[model samples]
Target: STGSATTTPIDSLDDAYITPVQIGTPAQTLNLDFDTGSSDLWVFSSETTASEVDGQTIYTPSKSTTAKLLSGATWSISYGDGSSSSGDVYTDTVSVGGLTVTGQAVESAKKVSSSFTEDSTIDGLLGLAFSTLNTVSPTQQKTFFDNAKASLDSPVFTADLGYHAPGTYNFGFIDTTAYTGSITYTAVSTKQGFWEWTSTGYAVGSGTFKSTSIDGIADTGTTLLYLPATVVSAYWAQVSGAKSSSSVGGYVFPCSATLPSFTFGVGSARIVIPGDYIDFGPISTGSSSCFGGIQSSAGIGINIFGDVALKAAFVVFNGATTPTLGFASK
Candidate 1:
C-alpha cells in the first residue's frame, strides 16, 4: 500500500513544513519536521530535563508496551543552524500515513538546545535522508524510509512544497497528477548521505543563463537558499539598496525594491524562483528592510537548495537504485 501525508507550512512563506507521524504501539501522534538533510528520527521525550522541555509535546515511550530500549545505545546531533539534541535509543513501531515499520529506531531526546526549546511547535524530526547518516552510537541506525522501502510498491517519494499553502508528500509511488510538465531527471551523488547534485547553471532577473555548475544538497530542513559567496554577490548587485547587514544577518534590501527573479538549470529544465519569494519578510518589527532568502554558503563548502528554492518546483526524491532527483514546475 502507498503512504501519503499532507505537509502544512508552520510559518509564513513556508519557513518549514510539519507532518503527523505515529510512534510506538498505542501510536502516539506527533507533528514532526520531515528533514532530508539529516537521518535521525528523534523527538522531545520524557527523558528530557523538565526545564528544557519548554512547550513542546513530549513523547512518552513508557506509554507504549512495544517500546524496547537498546542497551548502551545513544545519539547526539547538531544542525547547521547550531540547534542540537542528544538522547538514548528505543525500538518501537513507527508509521507514516499507511506505511508502518515494526521495529524502527526512535531516539528519545534527553537534552535539547535553546533553538529547539524555544520553538515549541515542532515536536520532533523525521529524517528522510540515507540511513548511513543516522547518529546512533556503536551502530548507525536505519531511517524509517529505509526499512519500509523494500515493502513499498516503488521506492520513491515526491515533495510538493507550496508557498503559504499546504502541500503533499507521497511515498512508495509517484502521483503523476501532483506535478505538471515532464519530469527532468538528474543524477545524485549520495557519497555524503545527501541528495547532492550540480545545477547546470543559473541566471539573475532576465539575464542570460551562465553555464557554470553549483554543487549543493536538496535540504528540506533548511528554510533559505544558500549559494556561493560570488553567486550571492552577483544576485544582490541587481537589487537596489541591497547590502550585507550584520545586525540583520545575511543580505538585506529596501522593502520597496523590485526584486529580480532567480533561475537555476537542471538538465534541459529551467526552474525559476519568483522575485517576491526572495524577499524573506522584514528584518525587524516595523522595519522597512527585508532579509534576502538567498545567502552565502561560504563556510558550509556546499550550496543548499532549501525551502525557498524547493517551493518553486515539484521535487522527486528517488531512492531506487542509482538514486536520482526529478524536477518539474508545479
Candidate 2:
C-alpha cells in the first residue's frame, strides 16, 4: 500500500513506464501508475489549473483522436498519499494494441495536487488491481475488464514485465511461454479493491514447518511483500544469531549466513522466492542482517503479496470467466 504501480520497462519508449488504462465505447489510453493499494483510474486534464497541473499531462477530449465525455456527472478522488484530482465523467472508444473496445468510461480532471502534478514523466494511474473503489456509479459500474471481457480474445489479462525495457501489457489471453504451469491458484475476495489470498505455509533453507501459515493478497501493482509482524518475527527466529536492526526499519540477519530457502504453498502448488531478491537490496542497518522477504504490516487491512512475490510466478486475473485469479510458474 506504499502507493504507485509496479515499475516495468517500456520497450517502445526505451524507459520504465506506468500505464493508466481505462474503458469507454472505444478504449481510452493514458499513462497509468498501476497501483495495488487503491482501486481507481485517474488522469490529469486540460481543465486542471496550470499551477496545479504542473509537471503532469492531463487528457482532454480535444487532444485525443478518439475520446468522449459523459454529461450530468462529475468524478473526484483523493489518494491515501494525500494527492487529489477531479474531473467530469466521459465515455469514449478505447483500445490497447489490437484489443479495442467501445463505450468505456473515463475521467477528465479539473484539479490536481503537487505530488501528482509535479511528475513530468508519469502522466496518471490506471488501477488494474480491482475496481471496488471505482467512482463509476452502480448504474455505470462496468470496469475496463468488465466491459472489455467480451470483446477480448481471451478471458485473462497477463503482463510481461519489461526486461530492462518496456514490458508488454496484454489483455484477454496470456502468452504461455512467459511462465511455467506449476503455478498456484488463490481465490479472489472483493471486500477490498483486490482479490486476496493467504499463505499456506513457508519453507526456509531446507527448514521444515510442521504447521505454519502466511496469509496475504497478490497485487501486481505493489513493489514489496508486506507481511504480518508476528510472521516476520517468527521467520527471523529460525536464523542463527539473528539481530534486530533499526537502520532499515526491520530485523536483519547476517548476509553471509546460509540464507534460508523459503517456499510458499498455495492450494497444492509451491512457489519459492529467489534468494537474490530476498537479499537483493542493501539493508539500511550497518549490520549484515538481511531483510526477510516477508516484512511486517499486520495492523494493515490485509497483507499485500506484491510484485516481489508475484514476479516469481505467472499470474492471470480472470475478470471474465470465473471471476478468479490464476497463478503458474515458468
Q: Which ten residues in a row have the lowest lDDT in candidate 2?
A: 1-10
Model 2, global lDDT = 0.60
Which parts of model 2 are misplaced by more than 4 Å? 1-17, 20-29, 78-84, 137-140, 162-166, 209-213, 236-261, 279-293
Top model by lDDT, which number?
1
lDDT of each: 0.90, 0.60
TM-score of each: 0.98, 0.76
User: How does model 1 score by TM-score?
Assistant: 0.98
Q: Model 1, 1-330: lDDT tens per residue?
A: 579989999887577899999898788998899998999999999999889887888889999999999889999999999899999999999888888898899999999999889888899999988988999999899998888889988988888888889888888988888778988999999999999999998999999998899999999999999999989999999998999887767999999998999999999889999998888778887889988999999978889999989989889999988899999987
Return the top candidate by TM-score: 1
Q: Once superposed on the true structure, which residue ranges of model 1 sit more than 4 Å away at CA?
A: none
